[PDB]
Subunit: 547 residues, 4 copies
């Protein structure tokens, strides 16, 4: 905007130059019978406007004086006044105003498309934003807190809009209809308000983070396409890690056929062994679809070594999962788990452990404003002997789930020092504290930020197949010996049935190929893992054998 | 104004030009016997002060040199010093004091007339302003809160004054004596303070919004022309909509409005149950089933099953929307009447499953509006 | 500071001018054999430095070119660079910095003398400051709150210093030793800290405002020269006004001889009558030393009309005060006073009324964190029927003493409307609310700001005789018939005894002359009122009759 | 730096002068057969670019006019545009970003070495800084509080960094690996967090101030080189001074220090009474006579009469001074030992009537000081 105005002025200056120069030659002729070249004209005009004033070329008539006077003043006005002033107004003012005074972005440009709207900022969404700035996605966070808008503007991995998140006018300004996705991370009532409002304008996909698992249904009603119960999930990931021996934990039931479960390896016979060595698939018929270690989901090799902290992601039938449970295959007696901190997450960890059930003891300073179903031992875990009196002595494991990382680090320190034996699972509110929890003696650390970010992140990237795979199903099929040697693109599987190949594992191998390329040459005995509508799965074995 | 001082300077600059041009000709003639035209003198004076300096016309006598030096310096002082120093100190100064540091308005111009003072801005009075915009009244909102004056400045269909509403000196700078009308929408004690203070200056008509219907008489006594008990009226609208035996009405929210709806249902009478998470600081004539309702089964406990009606009257619109969702979810047909604190939530309450929605801001703005028009 | 530097530069410019001009004439001569006048030199030099460059006088030698080049550049540097830059640094920067950014005054100039230090800002001291800015006294308020320092700096009836009030280093910076007076209006512990610290540096007089009358002694110990129990005093002024009929209230006992008391006129036989008509002095022998009405203490005339709201200031012997009490002279039966608000002031009003005693009832929302001696009826006076249930019906008077003026205005309104008979005394936290309390129906309004300011103000102005009259005594003496016709300056009373004439009243008149001028001619039967040490009062009737 | 860019510009300006002067002579000769000296060319080029314009030397050919025009414009661009635009954008910009808007330091220079990091600034650590000033160490105080960093900026004998003490990236920018020593004066949990974080980067010696003596072992475990239990030590100093039957000691204040003094007196043992206005959030092994003492007769009630000693241990110096006054007033000779949180109140406690004063900041600074010197 400003640049155009600038060298638009430069153009007007040039025209003034040529004009004055042309008039100069004209006057010198018709007024004093003197003839100057075009160059002399430019030369003189520049000499005057610029106030050099050599004086080698001057007029002698009053009319010439009147003209020279006019050009002279023109130079001062357009080179000594307008020019600097305009620079102070077009450049200087806008700079100092927008650097000493926050001017809130209240609206988004009309041409904004495919952007991601973030409502409700916190560690989770902050980490999500930094993570997807590593891909340069257009993020726009919204907030109705002036002070927060400022803080978010000084440092920016994203644009910040300041306005009421639940005002349809404000949502129209954000271009919600043209937006790619929407993260609803406000309170549950505000989320419900947000979803209904957004839905009155568009069908833009919405991912809501629910603070209380019971409200999940309500948010789907208000218009949310996906609901993520973070605290429930977080409590669960603390829980599955607290037992003395890892146990199967169910994840998904794809229409009562394919089951997805996860298994922490600690204290199991699989610890220390390799995937091939443990022979999990041979003895259970299960598919190992991934190994989660060091915050990275890798593909299962046969030489891969399972560590105490490894976590297997598994897929198969109900009986195949029951086989694995038998192999583990039993829990030690008198298991007792202390849970320090009875907030939403600690509360969820308790609920998960009760689903089994494993005996536990909750400990917190004050009564829960949201929970009534749990009996809590009241006291300050930091104040001497509060844990001793609660009988921390016969505990087999501890979950430290305070909302303060330094306190969790201190408790992990003390517990590991007084009980070098028990499992210690700790929670990190921020990732800048994860390593210290390990250094303090924790057997595993669950990070709010990374778990939250990974989930939301994946829900985002796989959006083009999120609402798709939503309502649909994942199933497994023994590759028909008829296609033994044919390429995925050659079989033309999708155009017939409608499903999609998401994995191909060898007959006698823990080695699996995830998201195989069309060029992949199929083999004999191979086991396919497909995904599609609960209609195409039945129209699969039908359409495939037909044509 | 900065325009007058500016062109008044151009005036002085012009006089200086003519003065110097004339003195020029005079010296050229009397000192050196040289005759120059008027244009020549203007041309020379401009040439010197503008520092161009063609040199085609110079003196040769000492007195001429002196004069030439004086004009040169004049051009530097009045064109290269005062002009810019003026520029910056004249209007680049106001810029900082009004754009780098928020400067609240603490007084209206002397001749401000026919304006409507608003005391206590909120959804109702905000809806009032944007409603009578076509009538093009000058609305002035008054507030003793700095941060609020600041926020009311950025976006506007109304002027914002910052000061104590109950201070006589502040009201005089607001020109209350010349105002069209005054809307008192503060606490009842504050309203009373405001009325008596205003009445000591003038008899500008005052429309007071009163919280407790009993206080209506006192506000009149203080000097209010009209008293509007909105919470009673809004409560009545809720109670009316929730009815038109074994009829049983759940009222979620025991604030003033919810309380008024209960009071209304007694007159019928229609059995009802009040539900809140706190005790009423102003009410003690109603029985309230305490315990937060957003949790989940607090309504199930109370028995949202055998009820015939539900009134949602929290002072938070999103909470109202959530409760409406939950209710419509638990019971697909029970009559639900929801309260909307702001008109921007009216549509989401209906979308949530409400059968009727009472809009505080709409009913408020309308009543106050027809009270200003019919005056 | 800046101006000097400015026209110091102007001087250096002039010297440069004369120098270059002198060198010019020199070079033109010894280099080109040309002779120019002094004026031509100045003219040329100005022509170059200023960049006009007529060209009518130029050099032709390389050395001349080198010189012209040097002068030319000198002009650009000292007129086009330094000059504006210096203006931006000496003027522009200091202005924008100290107008967009608060720079705290941390110290006072070394030569600061006779100033008044204010510690602890509030309505009282704010009003005190505005009041004594009407006399242009040098006030300096001190505070350790950054945010408060800013607010006090934007608008200023005084300089503001930001620092710890109880730090001797900070006190030395304030020049406490050279200061006139010090107002200690902090908490009692902070005041005690302040006094001890100030006392370790100087003997500068200190006036402390105590928040709890019991701490008064402690503050005199720490070094305070004067202690003002504002809340006690305020409670008293509410109390003396609440009774159905005004009653004598003791103020000072000057060594068991001269007594000072005050009497509100409401409900007494003196109401409506004039001072002469009531014949108070004739019937009691008392001296009427002042009439306090409409916030102004005037001298008692005989034609002066006493109104319901008038307050007599009286002086005389114990029996003379007892005579007046008899004239009034009795209180109505079943007096019952409701006191709304049990803060420090309301509490003090109760204590005063108990000193008589008059039956009362305290009413407040919560228990007092400081009082234990009073039984309080708990409830919200604003919530319907709280006063009704307390039996406001049989009250003879009400004192409304909430810490919120609007609430006091509302209560005054309602009470006067439901009980048009009872006395209503109300308290104003700020003077901007006094008139409205009257308009609401209050019989009298006690203003914190004005009472506080008047007291402190007087303690200040009369400082030169404050600590003097402190410890001293005020006494009355029947003018000896020996000086019947002599002038105050002629009698030479002070040089003999040491006392001072503060009043002279006629034998048969309520007319009194306060602070009589030395020229005043004394009469016969006149009654003198003097002040001095409890040593000079005895050395009075002795020294006067002797010589 | 702004000096290099500046004189580097003067360098380019100089080259332009010589280039134009040489081109000048070349054109004058080849275009018009006129011969000019080197000084003449410099003199002409300066005369044109500086816009003086004497005119004593002008071209007469078109190509000369063109060249003359080019130099004129060069002087305007490089002397009347870039020079000032530079000025303002070069160093009048930094001025605003560092004087109109506080800019906290979030990172120390790469080569910072031998510095002492302070975490948790307070009277003790503040007294430490002003004490070892003659040794001329570079002390850096770290704080995650903006408003505190701002205040610590105006007055200084030490540099202030703003950031999370327990963030590894923040500690790396603080150059912990190259620091002389680290003083951890935060909460015990925070200290533990700080130690482990620091230990993952380096083995810089750490001196931790610990609140609860039991936590000393854990801080060591985290990685602290030395653990200083000040509250235990200060409490012991109080108890020691208050003694060296029917001996009875009043301890006013049951904070950690007051609590430590009580614990100390048990070992003697010497009978004592704790007096506070609240219950101890960290202690439950002592009986405390509750009820505020500043009111008046709370000490009289308890029996300040038959007592043989008084320890004043509130965490507020003025309150301590007041209590000392009141005590010395009620009893002219009973032994009084007062605690001073800051060294600026030590003298007023003695003036108030204390028999001995333990100075938290002095004892603190001394211990930590001799711990840094002897290292
Ligand atoms: O400098 C001019 C001068 O002119 C007058 O003096 C003489 C002048 O010197 C002669 O050249 C001639 O013009 O006649 C003049 C007198 O008639 C003025 O008197 C004098 O003021 C003035 O300076
Ligand atoms: O404009 C100068 C010109 O000089 C040369 O041309 C001629 C010139 O016209 C004659 O006046 C004389 O000086 O001899 C010159 C040739 O020997 C250059 O050739 C030409 O480049 C230059 O423009
Ligand atoms: O420069 C002005 C010119 O005007 C005309 O075109 C003349 O023919 C020409 O001689 C002259 O040079
Ligand atoms: O992810 C699996 C989830 O399945 C069910 O929803 C369970 O209620 C829940 O405990 C579990 O977390
Ligand atoms: O201006 C320079 C002067 O120098 C000497 O003083 C000469 O005597 C004089 O002729 C000349 O005018
Ligand atoms: O001013 C007179 C005062 O004398 C005494 O100090 C009384 O205790 C007090 O009630 C009264 O206010
Ligand atoms: Ca850390
Ligand atoms: Ca809405
Ligand atoms: Ca008022
Ligand atoms: Ca002190
Ligand atoms: K020029
Ligand atoms: K010339
Ligand atoms: K020029
Ligand atoms: K010139
Ligand atoms: K010239
Ligand atoms: K010439
Ligand atoms: Zn729970
Ligand atoms: Zn009610
Ligand atoms: Zn009391
Ligand atoms: Zn203890």
């Amino acid at each position: 905007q400003n640049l155009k105005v600038l060298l638009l002025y430069c153009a007007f200056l040039l025209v003034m130059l040529l004009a004055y120069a042309s008039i100069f030659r004209y006057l010198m002729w018709h007024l004093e019978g003197r003839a100057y070249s075009f160059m002399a004209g430019i030369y003189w005009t520049i000499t005057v406007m610029t106030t050099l004033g050599f004086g080698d070329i001057t007029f002698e008539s009053d009319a010439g004086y009147l003209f020279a006077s006019i050009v002279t003043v023109s130079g001062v006005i357009f080179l000594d006044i307008i020019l600097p002033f305009g620079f102070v107004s077009m450049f200087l003012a806008p700079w100092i105003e927008r650097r000493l005074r926050y001017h809130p972005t209240i609206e988004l440009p009309d041409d904004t498309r495919g952007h991601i709207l973030i409502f409700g900022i916190d560690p989770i969404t902050r980490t999500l934003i930094r993570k997807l700035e590593s891909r340069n996605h257009l993020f726009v966070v919204v907030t109705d807190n002036y002070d927060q808008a400022l803080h978010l503007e000084e440092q920016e991995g994203f644009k910040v809009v300041y306005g009421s998140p639940t005002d349809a006018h404000v949502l129209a300004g954000l271009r919600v209809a043209a937006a790619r996705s929407i993260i609803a991370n406000l309170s549950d009532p505000d989320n419900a308000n947000l979803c209904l409002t957004v839905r009155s304008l568009c069908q833009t996909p919405i991912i809501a983070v629910v603070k209380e698992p019971v409200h999940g249904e309500l948010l789907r009603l208000a218009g949310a396409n996906q609901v993520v119960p973070l605290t429930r999930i977080l409590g669960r990931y603390l829980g599955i890690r607290a037992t003395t021996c890892g146990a199967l934990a169910h994840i998904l039931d794809s229409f009562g056929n394919l089951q997805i479960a996860e298994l922490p390896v600690h204290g199991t016979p699989f610890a220390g062994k390799t995937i091939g060595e443990s022979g999990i698939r041979q003895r259970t018929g299960l598919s190992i679809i991934g190994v989660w270690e060091r915050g990275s989901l890798t593909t299962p090799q046969r030489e891969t070594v399972l560590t105490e902290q490894s976590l297997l992601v598994l897929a198969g039938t109900k009986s195949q999962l029951a086989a694995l449970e038998y192999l583990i295959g039993e829990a030690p007696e008198d298991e007792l788990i202390f849970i320090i901190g009875h907030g939403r997450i600690g509360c969820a960890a308790a609920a998960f452990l009760d689903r089994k059930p494993v005996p536990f003891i909750l400990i917190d300073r004050q009564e829960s404003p949201v929970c009534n179903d749990h009996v809590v031992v009241y006291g300050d875990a930091t104040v001497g002997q509060t844990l001793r009196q609660a009988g921390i002595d016969r505990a087999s494991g501890i979950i430290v789930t305070t909302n303060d990382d330094s306190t969790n680090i201190f408790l992990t320190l003390a517990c590991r020092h007084l009980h070098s034996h028990i499992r210690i699972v700790a929670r990190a509110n921020g990732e800048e504290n994860v390593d210290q929890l390990y250094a303090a003696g924790a057997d595993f650390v669950v990070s709010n930020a990374s778990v939250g970010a990974n989930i939301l992140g994946n829900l985002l990237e796989h959006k083009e197949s999120a609402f798709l795979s939503e309502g649909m199903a994942v199933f497994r099929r023994p590759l028909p010996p008829a296609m033994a040697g044919k390429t995925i693109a050659e079989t033309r599987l999708r155009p017939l049935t409608g499903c999609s190949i998401v994995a191909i594992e060898a007959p006698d191998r823990a080695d699996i190929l995830i998201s195989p390329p069309p060029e992949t040459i199929l083999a004999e005995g191979a086991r396919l893992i497909l995904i599609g509508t609960s209609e195409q799965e039945k129209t699969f074995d039908q359409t495939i054998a037909a044509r």
